UniProtKB/Swiss-Prot annotation, chain A:
One Pfam entry name: Ribosomal_S10
Functional description taken from the UniProt entry: Component of the small ribosomal subunit. The ribosome is a large ribonucleoprotein complex responsible for the synthesis of proteins in the cell.
Keywords recorded for this protein, A-Z: Acetylation, Cytoplasm, Isopeptide bond, Phosphoprotein, Ribonucleoprotein, Ribosomal protein, Ubl conjugation
GO molecular function annotations of the record: MDM2/MDM4 family protein binding; RNA binding; structural constituent of ribosome; ubiquitin ligase inhibitor activity
Phylogenetic placement of the source organism: Eukaryota, Metazoa, Chordata, Craniata, Vertebrata
Modified residues (N6-acetyllysine): K19, K60
Protein name from the UniProt record: Small ribosomal subunit protein uS10
Family of this protein: Belongs to the universal ribosomal protein uS10 family.
GO biological process, one term: positive regulation of signal transduction by p53 class mediator
Primary gene name: RPS20
Curated annotation (Swiss-Prot), chain B:
Phosphothreonine: modified positions: T42, T70
Post-translational modification: Methylation by PRMT1 is required for import into the nucleolus and for ribosome assembly. Sumoylation by SUMO1 enhances protein stability through increased resistance to proteolysis.
Species assigned in the record: Homo sapiens (Human)
Record-given protein name: Small ribosomal subunit protein uS3
Similarity comment: Belongs to the universal ribosomal protein uS3 family.
Residues represented out of the complete protein: 1 to 114 of 243
Asymmetric dimethylarginine: modified positions: R64, R65, R67
Annotated localization: Cytoplasm; Nucleus; Nucleus, Nucleolus; Mitochondrion inner membrane
Cited function: Component of the small ribosomal subunit. The ribosome is a large ribonucleoprotein complex responsible for the synthesis of proteins in the cell. Has endonuclease activity and plays a role in repair of damaged DNA. Cleaves phosphodiester bonds of DNAs containing altered bases with broad specificity and cleaves supercoiled DNA more efficiently than relaxed DNA. Displays high binding affinity for 7,8-dihydro-8-oxoguanine (8-oxoG), a common DNA lesion caused by reactive oxygen species (ROS). Has also been shown to bind with similar affinity to intact and damaged DNA.
Coiled-coil intervals, chain numbering: none
Recorded superkingdom: Eukaryota
Post-translational modification N6-acetyllysine, affected residues: K62
Domain KH type-2, chain residue ranges per copy: 21-92
From Swiss-Prot, chain D:
Subunit composition and interactions: Part of the 40S ribosomal subunit. Part of the small subunit (SSU) processome, composed of more than 70 proteins and the RNA chaperone small nucleolar RNA (snoRNA) U3.
Post-translational modification: Monoubiquitinated at Lys-23 and Lys-29 by RNF25 in response to ribosome collisions (ribosome stalling): ubiquitination promotes subsequent activation of RNF14, leading to EEF1A1 ubiquitination and degradation and rescue of stalled ribosomes. Deubiquitination at Lys-29 by USP16 is required for maturation of the 40S ribosomal complex.
Section covered of the full-length record: 85 to 151 of 156
Official protein name in the record: Small ribosomal subunit protein eS31
Residue numbers of N6-acetyllysine PTMs: K20, K29
Spans traversing the lipid bilayer: none
Zinc finger (C4-type): 37-60
Cross-link (Glycyl lysine isopeptide (Lys-Gly) (interchain with G-Cter in ubiquitin)): K23, K29
Swiss-Prot record, chain E:
Function per UniProt: Component of the 40S ribosomal subunit. The ribosome is a large ribonucleoprotein complex responsible for the synthesis of proteins in the cell.
List of residues that carry Phosphotyrosine: Y12
Quaternary state and interactors: Component of the small ribosomal subunit. The methylated form interacts with NPM1.
Top-rank taxon: Eukaryota
Subcellular location: Cytoplasm; Nucleus, Nucleolus
Record PTM text: Methylated by PRMT5. Methylation is necessary for its interaction with NPS1, its localization in the granular component (GC) region of the nucleolus, for the proper assembly of ribosomes, protein synthesis and optimal cell proliferation.
Protein name per the record: Small ribosomal subunit protein eS10
Single GO term (MF): structural constituent of ribosome
GO biological-process terms attached to the record: cytoplasmic translation; translation
GO annotation, cellular component aspect: cytoplasm; cytosol; cytosolic ribosome; cytosolic small ribosomal subunit; focal adhesion; membrane; nucleolus; nucleoplasm
Major localization class: cytoplasm
Family: Belongs to the eukaryotic ribosomal protein eS10 family.
Keywords, ordered alphabetically: Cytoplasm, Diamond-Blackfan anemia, Isopeptide bond, Methylation, Nucleus, Phosphoprotein, Ribonucleoprotein, Ribosomal protein, Ubl conjugation
RNA sequence: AAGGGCACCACCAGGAGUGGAGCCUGCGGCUUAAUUUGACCAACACGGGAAACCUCACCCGGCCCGGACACGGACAGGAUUGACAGAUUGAUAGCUCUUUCUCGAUUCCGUGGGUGGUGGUGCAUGGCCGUUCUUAGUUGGUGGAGCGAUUUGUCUGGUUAAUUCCGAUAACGAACGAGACUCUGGCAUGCUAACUAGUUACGCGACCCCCGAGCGGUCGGCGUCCCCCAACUUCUUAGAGGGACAAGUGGCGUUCAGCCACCCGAGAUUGAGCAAUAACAGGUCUGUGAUGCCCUUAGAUGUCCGGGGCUGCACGCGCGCUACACUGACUGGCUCAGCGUGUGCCUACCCUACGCCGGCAGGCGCGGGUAACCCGUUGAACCCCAUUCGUGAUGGGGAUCGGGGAUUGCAAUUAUUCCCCAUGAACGAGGAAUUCCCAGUAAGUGCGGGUCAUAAGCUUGCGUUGAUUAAGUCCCUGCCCUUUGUACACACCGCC
């Protein structure tokens, strides 16, 4: 086994996360695990504002940089065991995955 | 948990690692037709692919230089042993890489062409 | 001098304890998100980290 | 410039000759005429200094005072 | 450099065990990270590798705040006859599994 | 000089102001051992520059080589390195001296040669950035004209925010810029989905009415992803899509390009990012192991340590904060946010709930959070509702200054900051001048981030309350196109 696991995906782009959150749950449906829906956490917007010039002379122009971090949560729940069933990750570069159990 | 840092610091550190590795590879493989670096990280292990033009040149005598750089990137960032692998990849359409063309132009000017 | 005074002055805090992780500068550091990079070096490398301009 | 103090004289060592600060007598009878540093880090090999009012161990940096 | 044999040979055998060595540029670092048990300051290894660079047995690369010294073929036999080791033991980068 | 057009870094009509006072801060000047220095629309809260030490580059002193490598001397009968005591020193720097021990080939001396430098030169340079200029402008190929520099293309006109387009046409065909583009805001009771977001319903409770209601009212009280033991996605989140095109109607218009008005609509102009050719002796060599050349390199312009300085004041200026009060101050009560951060490679330094003590600043235990899980339903301020005050330099204002208590740190003096009790100064709306601005805008008002061991009168963002005036013009200051004049071309700050 009685296992209930959580898989979290996080990256900087939405295309890769969307296709992973698509193909993973599709593999789960074809491999008949009932799937808790993909939950989209609020986006983390890392903002860094910095003077453009390396000198301090100029017209006080500020360059603002953003990093967007997006993360999704998918809970895999089967009456049978899960880890011995699903082993493949199928993860492209640019996205980080973390798999925990309901205990942690 | 307490051992791992937050996601914000983690992504920033990953970007810093990419930038540091890119700077090192640029300063090291300058004459070897360096183009770029692509890192694929997994919890099991990580793979570093060096896009360049002269793969046979970046690889030393029987991979001596690629072994050297693998050990360097091993020690400088302190991965677990055997958890990083360095592959050298030949680029396609080297005329389309601005890095390779700029490096070749710099080499020509250093050689002494007008 | 010997080991007793060469580096004896405390630098456990303050502006003298921090330097840019790239250019070893002590001015205009960015410590947000543990970046620890100089103001100019962050502009230099910000494309590589992933800090990109949107607005 | 015009530094008020003169150029400080850096130390030059005394340029010591052969040590020979121990003697044996009547066809060999050992006489340690120097103090022995008893610590483990000094060991039983090195001798101590023979200053006019104390003894100094070169390695152990122990100073034994006799009053 | 006034650094003694007891850590000169330590640095040299570290450099010969694997074909490279990485050293952060910090003359005030109390201890070099690897060879943790030898009580060697970072300054000693930095100047030793600088001397090896000067004599030509190692080639030097400098990223942001790090040195990436690469041992050379002229370094092979100089380390070998410094350490009095037969030319059968090689650095790890030279020969692997062969 | 003319014609056409345009812009709140221009004006008009106005708003809030600044210039007046106190203070903070940045420049000049003065003084000083030093008050390090760059910069003079497009310098002066700018160098992310809020400096006790560090920073630091300046001043007064004191250490170390962290002078590779080559050569020659030197040496295990010792090249040479450290060090206790006394003086000496600011120093417990064996720095130096008296004094002897101790390391052992790593060094030491000399000659070349390094190396380092927040030293000089931004008028030798790269990169970046500012500006010209965010205006609509810019360029080839082939063809035409001209001996040629050049010109046409790139235009009379209409239109546009736009050389934007319709059209004319010795030009044709293109290219960049504009636009298109990306992010953002406003609409989706339509789709997907949620125990790190909820709503509704139900069931346990707690309290009021219980006269009698009772499917009565409140609950940010507890439960129903605890796995069988409710559903659903409106509200929150974030993806995929749609949605707006001058599309529909009327009028103007060459009835073209377009313009005005209205309906329906969430929306009929949401703000940003990027941003051409050519250039400036514009700024940075004090961001860089970007860098040429010069200077210095052992009594150092390298580096470290101690102290001081960067704050220093007859004075002038700039960016700001606080006010001059009753559209208010004080006291109490009630009631509302959104950005966004949070424990670290070196690197020590996190955000904090709750409980106890103290009057406050704070202190002490117990946790939570590497985070839509905890701070936190971020109980913010202004505002609102009541109290006192009463037109006075007053309960306005809080400068200056005395005494005392904590916190950070190795260290608080020239007061780091915070707290308490005392003093209550100028200031009664500010000359000549001058800045910014058109709708959720100005302004009032607080809250985050950066800087941060300690800290914001700064800056970058966020929300809350929320307007007056205007839908125009070339009058001033400027910009674009055409014609024109020129004795200018370093280009009217010209020339003479
Ligand atoms: Mg009062």
């Amino acid at each position: 086994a009685i296992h209930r696991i959580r898989i979290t995906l996080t990256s900087r782009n939405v295309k890769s996360l969307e296709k992973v959150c698509a193909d993973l749950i599709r593999g789960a449906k074809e491999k008949n695990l009932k799937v808790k829906g993909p939950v989209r956490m609020p986006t983390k917007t890392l903002r860094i504002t910095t003077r453009k010039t390396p000198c301090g002379e100029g017209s006080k122009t500020w360059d603002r940089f953003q990093m967007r971090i997006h993360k999704r949560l998918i809970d895999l729940h089967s009456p049978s065991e899960i880890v011995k069933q699903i082993t493949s990750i199928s993860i492209e570069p640019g996205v980080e995955v973390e798999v925990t159990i309901a205990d942690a | 948990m307490a051992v791992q840092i937050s996601k914000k610091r983690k992504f920033v550190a990953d970007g810093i690692f990419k930038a540091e590795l890119n700077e090192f590879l640029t300063r090291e493989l300058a004459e070897d037709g360096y183009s770029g670096v692509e890192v694929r990280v997994t919890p099991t292990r990580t793979e570093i692919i060096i896009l360049a033009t002269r793969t046979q040149n970046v690889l030393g005598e029987k991979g001596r230089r690629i072994r050297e750089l693998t050990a360097v990137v091993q020690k400088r960032f302190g991965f677990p042993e055997g958890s990083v692998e360095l592959y050298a990849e030949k680029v396609a359409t080297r005329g389309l890489c601005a890095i390779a063309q700029a490096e070749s132009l710099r080499y020509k000017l250093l050689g002494g062409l007008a | 001098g010997h080991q007793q005074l060469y580096w004896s002055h405390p630098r456990k805090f303050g502006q003298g304890s921090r330097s840019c992780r790239v250019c070893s500068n002590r001015h205009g550091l960015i410590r947000k998100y543990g970046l620890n990079m100089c103001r100019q070096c962050f502009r230099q490398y910000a494309k590589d980290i992933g800090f990109i301009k949107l607005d | 410039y015009t530094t008020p103090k003169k150029n400080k004289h850096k130390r030059k060592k005394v340029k010591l000759a052969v040590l020979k600060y121990y003697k044996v007598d009547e066809n060999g009878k050992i006489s340690r005429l120097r103090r022995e540093c008893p610590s483990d880090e000094c060991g039983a090999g090195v001798f101590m200094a023979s200053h006019f009012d104390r003894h100094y161990c070169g390695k152990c940096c122990l100073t034994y005072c006799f009053n | 450099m006034l650094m003694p044999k007891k850590n000169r040979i330590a640095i040299y055998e570290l450099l010969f065990k694997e074909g490279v060595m990485v050293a952060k540029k910090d003359v005030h670092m109390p201890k070099h990270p690897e060879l943790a048990d030898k009580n060697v300051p970072n300054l000693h290894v930095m100047k030793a590798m600088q001397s090896l660079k000067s004599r030509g047995y190692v080639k030097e690369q400098f990223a942001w705040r790090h040195f990436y010294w690469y041992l050379t073929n002229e370094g092979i036999q100089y380390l070998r006859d410094y350490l009095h080791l037969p030319p059968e033991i090689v650095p790890a980068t030279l020969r692997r599994s062969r």
